[PDB]
Amino acid sequence: GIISLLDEDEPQLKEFALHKLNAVVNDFWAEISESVDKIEVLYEDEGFRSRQFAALVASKVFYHLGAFEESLNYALGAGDLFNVNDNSEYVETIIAKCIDHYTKQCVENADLPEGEKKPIDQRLEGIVNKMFQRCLDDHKYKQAIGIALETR
Amino acid sequence: DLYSRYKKLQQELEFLEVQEEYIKDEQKNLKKEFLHAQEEVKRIQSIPLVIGQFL
Amino acid sequence: PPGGGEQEPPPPPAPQDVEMKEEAATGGGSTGEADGKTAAAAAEHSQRELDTVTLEDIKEHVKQLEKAVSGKEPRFVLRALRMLPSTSRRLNHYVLYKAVQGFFTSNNATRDFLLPFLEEPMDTEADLQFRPRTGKAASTPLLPEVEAYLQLLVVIFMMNSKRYKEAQKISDDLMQKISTQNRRALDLVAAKCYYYHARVYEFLDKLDVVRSFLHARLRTATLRHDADGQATLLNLLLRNYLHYSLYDQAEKLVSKSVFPEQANNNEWARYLYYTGRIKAIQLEYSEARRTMTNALRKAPQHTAVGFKQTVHKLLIVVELLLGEIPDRLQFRQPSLKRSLMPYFLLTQAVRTGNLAKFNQVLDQFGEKFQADGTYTLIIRLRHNVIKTGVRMISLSYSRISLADIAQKLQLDSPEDAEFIVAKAIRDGVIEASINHEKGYVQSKEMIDIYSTREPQLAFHQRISFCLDIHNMSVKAMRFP
Amino acid sequence: MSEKKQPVDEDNWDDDNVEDDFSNQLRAELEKHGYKMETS
């Protein structure tokens, strides 16, 4: 019942609250489900500069209750802290949502055929060639031509 | 190369996915055609008839 | 000595025959089954494994006793090796070591020496393919051995099993990941060992950290590979998160899903009993009575013996709070009889409205209720019986006076009777009108439910229930 | 079943369902209903 600690508008209590969460978030994944409305207070707060990290904990609760595309929306505005983590499983699940959203947008862009372009976030297209640098550095040529067929 | 076949393998996946409505729509038609064939054999011979003794 | 000495040699060949061919025919058979097709799974040997392990869990396990040295554990775990068809030589070497027990002086390699033995499939260089067979080699020797329960220094070996088999979990998540179909075969094996996880801790201390380790395997099975896997993990949750506080009751809302499809059969039938006791603490009776009734009728096959009987005992507990229950000896079993005797006469005092009889049952039979933890209802069941007593009278009579039903139900006073009938109307229990002067209660027959209304409206749920089974039969017909 | 924590923790029997309703209510009863003869 630490949810009541979020009522205070003073920032230094929030970093100690999330310091508790992200460590035990594995066991408390069920507890974060009721923190939705009170996380948005921090995410929409202008004086709260951790909204990049607050978008991650907002993606964990929605992933717990069955929401996916909404977590991908928060992944956009999550800044560089979201795309800097390549570790374990969480990297391959987000790129499966992001690159599929990227490759279905590029096919849509080729149907314009020119002009009246849809908005393309620099973060979703930015990790394309960024993670593609991991290919040429790994020297494996077989999938180096594969990304070009993906994005078309 | 593994993404190549990964883009190859969903073809026959989706090719058999459209093969689902292939048979399902075909078999129900033919089913109604077989039910129409039930009216055929029941139509024959209709009238008239003649009595006979089974041996 | 000569009589008992000559009778020692014959038995050990029996584990050298059937127990050999247990994992020789199934494991050697599941080899090609897990190399391809692998549809689903199926891999029916993993379900045949349910007909072995559970059969071995009585006799013989790996051991036993029987009059061997318990050398079957090191035998199959060494010299995997393996390679192309020479794996038969490994089974041949398993036959060669059978004479070692019968000829030379037999030595027990279990326990202390089992620590490097579980590393041998990795040390044999290499496995090289099936972790479930080595998971079986890290379980079937050790997990059926847990049934000894000596508690001294071998529990850490049961923990060492949960260690090296967590190294099999390391090979579970890292290896494959693409059309595995071994995980779905392991979902039966990973279930069991995770069950033995919970069981071994219960003898020492309930697991605080494994609760966090449970959500690990829980969440990571979604969405990548989940078949029957998260259900068994959700069973671990609702099992212990019930017996231990807190908040775990309402947790079922965000988890479900369901999780579909319910597997395997009776395995999900008991799950409705788990959440059944939960929803019983939510005080909602109607959803609790249907999930408890469905828990008995969906549960095959037993025997033996009281494992299904004891779970059925506490299952009809929700019927005590329903207010409508018959005598429960129609559910009695001669084995469950002796255990249900303090819980038997309880419901016999529920059918009656006597306080002196009901309070005497709580005093003498309250000792048996301490192990069940059912004391939550005994305070609210007094209000349940007074509703059954008034329903018995209100259904038997058109008009019922408050003064005549006062002492008959021994409410003893007119004022609290006005409070009960008021709350009875609030709960929709009674339709009786009341004429207050002294006062008295004058009711009338309730009708117009008739025919054209209730049966045809209920038949909307009956046919919608039946027409779905038409699809259930077609779906089950499409697999063959 | 036997998994999880399941293992961790005519006849007169059929008529006994109805027969126990006689135990707590109205006995059988002969004597009392036989005493009601000369009561009124």
Distance (Å, whole) CA A57 – CA A17: 12
Closest to C346 (Cα-Cα) out of C377, C371, C387: C377
Which pair of structure tokens corresponds to residue C100? 């070692």
C-alpha torsion sign, points C239, C243, C246, C252: positive
Run of H or E including D24: helix D12-24
Max intra-chain CA distance, chain D: 66
- Whether D20 has its CB under 8 Å from any CB of chain C: the answer is yes
Contact C117, C73 (CB under 8 A): yes
The backbone torsions φ and ψ at residue C61, rounded to the nearest 5 degrees and listed phi first, read 60, -140
| Distances from the Cα of C226 to the Cα of A137, C263, C467, angstroms | 34, 12, 29
Residue A127 token pair? 């990790």
Phi, then psi, of C173 in degrees rounded to 5? -80, -40
Find chain B residues with C-beta within 8 A of A143's C-beta.
1-3
Could you give the CA distance from residue C264 to residue C270 in angstroms, rounded to a whole number?
A: 11
3-state secondary structure of D32: helix
- Alpha-carbon C350 to chain mean position: 29
Looking up tokens 């090719």 gives B15
Does the beta carbon of A66 lie under 8 angstroms from any beta carbon of chain C?
yes
- Encode burial over B36-46: b for 16+ CB neighbours within 10 A, e otherwise: eeeeeeeeeee
Cα gap C8→A83, rounded to integer Å: 68
Are C429 and C387 within 8 A, CB to CB? Answer: yes
Distance CA A43, CA A14 (A): 12
CA distance B42 to chain A (A): 57
With contact defined as beta carbons under 8 Å apart, do C233 and C225 qualify?
no
Query: Are residues A149 and B7, on separate chains, in Cβ contact within 8 Å?
Result: yes
**3-class secondary-structure state, position D40:** coil
Contact call for residues C365 and C346 (beta carbons, < 8 A): yes
Closest CA to C78 of C54, C100, C55: C100
Residue D11 carries which DSSP code? Answer: -
Instruction: Give the C-alpha separation, A48 to A9, whole Å.
Output: 10
User: How many C-beta neighbours within 10 Å does residue C17 have?
Assistant: 11
Q: Are C424 and C390 in contact (CB under 8 A)?
A: yes
Query: Solving technique for this entry?
Result: cryo-EM
Nearest alpha-carbon partner for C183 in C120, C223, C130, C139: C130
Nearest one of A90, A122, A80 to A105, comparing CA atoms: A122
Let me know: does C42 contact C34? Beta carbons within 8 Å.
Answer: no
CB A53 within 8 A of CB A18: yes
B44 Cβ contact partners less than 8 Å away, ≥ 6 residues apart: none
Does residue C430 contact residue C400 with C-beta atoms inside 8 Å?
Answer: no
Distance between CA C440 and CA C404 in Å, rounded? Answer: 9
Does C220 sit within 8 Å of A29, measured CB to CB?
no
C359 close to C378: Cβ distance less than 8 angstroms: no
One-letter-per-residue 3-state SS of chain C:
CHHHHHCCCCCCCCHHHHHHHHHHHHHHHHHHHHHCCCCCCCCHHHHHHHHHHHHHCCCCCCCCCCCCCCCHHHHHHCCCCCCCCCHHHHHHHHHHCHHHHHCCCCCCCCHHHHHHHHHHHHHCCCCCCCHHHHHHHCCCCCCHHHHHCCCCCCHHHHHHHHHHHHHHHHHHHHCCCCCCCHHHHHHHHHHHHHHHHHHHHHHHCCCCHHHHHHHHHHHHCCCCCCCCHHHHHHHHHHHHHHHCCCCCCCCHHHHCCCCCCCCCCHHHHHHHHHHHHHHHHCCCCHHHHHHHHHHHHCCCCCCCCCHHHHHHHCCCHHHHHHCCCCCHHHHCCHHHHHHHHHHHHHHHHHCCCCHHHHHHHHHHHHHHHHHHCCHHHHHHHHHHHHHHHHHHHHHHCCCCCHHHHHHHCCCCCHHHHHHHHHHHHHCCCCCCCCECCCCECCCCCCCCCCCCCHHHHHHHHHHHHHHHHHHHHHHHHHCC
- Please provide residue C435's backbone torsions phi and psi, each rounded to the nearest 5 degrees: -105, 110
Residue C363 CA to residue C365 CA, distance in Å, equals 6
Q: Could you report how far apart the first and last alpha carbons of chain C are, in Å?
A: 59
Query: In this complex, do C54 and D2 lie within 8 Å of one another by their Cβ atoms?
Result: yes
Q: How many CA atoms lie within 13 A of C469 on its CB side?
A: 5
Asked whether A54 and A42 are in contact (CB, 8 A), the reply is yes
Q: Which of C101, C115, C116, C35 is nearest to C69 (CA)?
A: C101
> What is B1-55 written as a DSSP string?
-HHHHHHHHHHHHHHHHHHHHHHHHHHHHHHHHHHHHHHHHHHSS-S--------
By CB neighbour count within 10 A (0-12 exposed, 13-18 middle, 19+ buried), where does C268 fall?
Answer: buried
The CA distance from A109 to B46, in Å, is: 67
Query: Which chains neighbour A (Cβ–Cβ under 8 Å, 3 or more pairs)?
Result: B, C
The residues near C288 (Cβ < 8 Å, ≥ 6 apart) are C276, C279, C280, C282, C318, C321
Q: Do D16 and C327 touch (CB under 8 A)?
A: yes
Provide CB contacts within 8 A for B7, sequence distance 6+: A149
What's the token pair of residue C171? 């090979």
Cis peptide before C56 (omega within 30 of 0): no
Q: Among partner residues C199, C330, C352, which is closest to D17 by beta-carbon distance?
A: C330
C-chain residue closest to A1, CA distance: C247
Three-state DSSP state, D4 = coil
Q: Which tokens belong to C469?
A: 């089974």
The 3-state secondary structure of chain A, one letter per residue: CHHHHHHCCCCHHHHHHHHHHHHHHHHHCCHHHHHHHHHHHHHCCCCCCCHHHHHHHHHHHHHHHCCCHHHHHHHHCCCHHHHCCCCCCHHHHHHHHHHHHHHHHHHHHCCCCCCCCCCCCHHHHHHHHHHHHHHHHHCCCCCCCHHHHHHC
Element (H, E) at D36: helix D31-39
CA angle A129, A133, A138 (to 5 degrees): 145
Q: Coil, strand or helix: which one is D22?
A: helix
Q: Are A15 and A42 in contact (CB under 8 A)?
A: no
Amino acid at position A90, single letter: Y
Alpha-carbon torsion C148, C149, C152, C156, what sign?
Answer: positive
Alpha carbon distances (Å) from B33 to B26, B28, C119, C436: 10, 8, 66, 75
**Token pair recorded at residue A67:** 């929401």
End-to-end CA distance of chain D: 62
Residues in chain B with CB shorter than 8 Å from the CB of A142 are 1-2, 4
- Please state, in angstroms and rounded to a whole number, the distance separating the CA atoms of residues C358 and C351: 10
Cis ω before A52 (30° cut-off from 0): no
A49: its two tokens: 């500069």
Type of residue numbered A22? N
Phi, psi of A49 (to 5 degrees): -90, 0
Answer yes or no: are the C-beta atoms of C97 and C71 closer than 8 Å: yes
Query: Can you read off the two tokens belonging to residue C450?
Result: 């008739």
Q: To the nearest whole angstrom, how far is the Cα of C378 from the nearest Cα of chain A?
A: 29
Q: Are D23 and C339 in contact (CB under 8 A)?
A: no
B and D adjacent (3 or more CB pairs under 8 angstroms):
no
- Between CA C213 and CA C217 the distance in angstroms is 7
C-alpha pair distances (Å), C79 with each of A65, C113, C114 = 47, 15, 14
Cα angle: A63, vertex C291, C294; to 5 degrees: 120
In 3D space, the residue among C367, C374, C373 whose CA is nearest the CA of residue C321 turns out to be C374
Evaluated on CA atoms C98, C100, C106, C108, the torsion sign reads negative
Core vs surface per residue C303-325: b (16+ CB within 10 A) or e: eeebbbbbbbbbbbbbbbbbbeb
Report which secondary-structure segment, H or E, holds D18.
helix D12-24
Rounded distance, CA C258 to CA C261, Å?
8
Strand partners, C435: C440
Under 8 Å between Cβ of B4 and A146: yes
C70 vs B14, C73, C109, C158, CA distance in Å?
A: 54, 7, 8, 17
Look up residue A152 and give its two tokens: 């078309």
> What is the distance between the alpha carbons of residues B45 and C13, in angstroms, rounded to a whole number?
75
- Separation of CA B20 from chain center: 13
CB within 8 Å: C308 and D13: no
Show Cβ contacts of residue C354 under 8 Å, excluding neighbours closer than 6 positions: C410
Among C211, C247, C255, beta carbon nearest to A27: C211
Resolution for this model in angstroms, one decimal place? Answer: 5.8
Spatial CA neighbour of C63 closest among C15, C27, C113, C100: C15
CA nearest to C270, candidates C244, C239, C313: C239
**Cis preceding linkage at D9, omega within 30:** no
Establish whether chain D is in contact with chain A, requiring a minimum of 3 CB pairs below 8 angstroms. Answer: no
Ramachandran sector of residue B53 (left: φ over 0; alpha: ψ -120 to 50; beta: rest): beta
Burial of C188 (C-beta count, 10 Å sphere; 0-12/13-18/19+): buried
